[PDB]
Protein backbone atom coordinates (compact mmCIF):
# COMPACT_ATOMS: atom_id res chain seq x y z
CA UNK A 1 0.00 0.00 0.00
CA UNK A 2 1.93 3.00 -1.33
CA UNK A 3 1.37 5.94 -3.68
CA UNK A 4 4.09 7.12 -6.05
CA UNK A 5 4.75 10.88 -5.88
CA UNK A 6 5.72 11.81 -9.44
CA UNK A 7 4.89 15.51 -8.94
CA UNK A 8 8.24 16.25 -7.26
CA UNK A 9 10.40 18.65 -9.29
CA UNK A 10 14.06 17.68 -9.60
CA UNK A 11 16.45 20.36 -8.30
CA UNK A 12 19.83 20.18 -6.52
CA UNK A 13 19.67 21.28 -2.87
CA UNK A 14 21.35 24.44 -1.64
CA UNK A 15 24.18 24.60 0.90
CA UNK A 16 24.33 26.49 4.21
CA UNK A 17 26.74 26.87 7.14
CA UNK A 18 27.25 25.09 10.47
CA UNK A 19 28.59 27.87 12.71
CA UNK A 20 27.74 26.53 16.19
CA UNK A 21 25.88 23.27 15.58
CA UNK A 22 26.63 19.58 16.03
CA UNK A 23 27.68 19.74 19.69
CA UNK A 24 26.30 17.20 22.16
CA UNK A 25 27.04 15.71 25.56
CA UNK A 26 29.97 13.24 25.35
CA UNK A 27 28.88 10.70 27.97
CA UNK A 28 26.71 10.26 31.08
CA UNK A 29 29.30 11.76 33.47
CA UNK A 30 28.43 14.95 35.33
CA UNK A 31 30.89 17.82 34.89
CA UNK A 32 30.82 21.12 36.78
CA UNK A 33 33.25 24.05 36.35
CA UNK A 34 35.82 21.87 34.56
CA UNK A 35 37.34 22.32 31.09
CA UNK A 36 37.21 18.71 29.92
CA UNK A 37 38.66 17.69 26.55
CA UNK A 38 37.95 14.42 24.76
CA UNK A 39 37.99 12.82 21.31
CA UNK A 40 34.59 12.04 19.81
CA UNK A 41 32.61 12.22 16.57
CA UNK A 42 31.85 15.95 16.37
CA UNK A 43 30.65 18.22 13.57
CA UNK A 44 33.34 20.82 12.74
CA UNK A 45 32.49 24.45 13.33
CA UNK A 46 31.89 26.72 10.30
CA UNK A 47 31.66 23.64 8.06
CA UNK A 48 29.73 23.13 4.84
CA UNK A 49 26.32 21.47 5.22
CA UNK A 50 23.46 20.84 2.80
Amino acid sequence: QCVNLTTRTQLPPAYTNSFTRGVYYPDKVFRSSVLHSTQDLFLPFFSNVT
Binding site: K28, F30, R31, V34
Partner: protein, 50 residues
Protein backbone atom coordinates in the same frame (compact mmCIF):
# COMPACT_ATOMS: atom_id res chain seq x y z
CA UNK B 1 23.72 10.78 33.72
CA UNK B 2 24.78 8.27 36.37
CA UNK B 3 28.27 9.38 37.45
CA UNK B 4 30.18 12.61 37.95
CA UNK B 5 33.67 14.04 38.17
CA UNK B 6 35.25 17.05 39.87
CA UNK B 7 38.12 19.33 38.81
CA UNK B 8 40.60 16.79 40.23
CA UNK B 9 39.21 13.89 38.11
CA UNK B 10 37.69 12.03 41.07
CA UNK B 11 34.27 10.36 41.26
CA UNK B 12 32.82 12.82 43.76
CA UNK B 13 29.24 12.36 42.50
CA UNK B 14 27.07 9.29 41.97
CA UNK B 15 23.42 8.49 41.24
CA UNK B 16 21.35 5.90 43.09
CA UNK B 17 20.43 3.15 40.57
CA UNK B 18 17.05 2.50 42.26
CA UNK B 19 15.50 5.98 42.59
CA UNK B 20 16.05 9.61 41.56
CA UNK B 21 18.53 10.33 44.36
CA UNK B 22 21.89 12.07 43.86
CA UNK B 23 24.68 12.02 46.44
CA UNK B 24 27.97 13.89 46.87
CA UNK B 25 31.13 13.72 49.00
CA UNK B 26 31.85 15.51 52.30
CA UNK B 27 34.48 13.81 54.48
CA UNK B 28 33.70 12.28 57.86
CA UNK B 29 37.13 13.07 59.35
CA UNK B 30 40.81 13.51 58.48
CA UNK B 31 44.15 13.84 60.23
CA UNK B 32 47.82 14.57 59.71
CA UNK B 33 49.95 13.31 62.59
CA UNK B 34 53.17 15.03 63.64
CA UNK B 35 54.99 14.62 66.96
CA UNK B 36 56.96 17.41 68.65
CA UNK B 37 59.39 16.39 71.39
CA UNK B 38 62.75 17.53 72.81
CA UNK B 39 65.88 15.40 72.92
CA UNK B 40 66.07 12.15 74.85
CA UNK B 41 68.89 13.50 77.04
CA UNK B 42 66.80 16.55 77.97
CA UNK B 43 63.39 15.03 78.77
CA UNK B 44 60.82 12.51 77.55
CA UNK B 45 57.54 14.45 77.25
CA UNK B 46 55.84 14.25 73.84
CA UNK B 47 53.01 16.03 72.07
CA UNK B 48 51.05 15.09 68.94
CA UNK B 49 49.86 17.70 66.43
CA UNK B 50 46.95 16.95 64.07
Amino acid sequence: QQFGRDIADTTDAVRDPQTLEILDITPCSFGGVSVITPGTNTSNQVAVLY
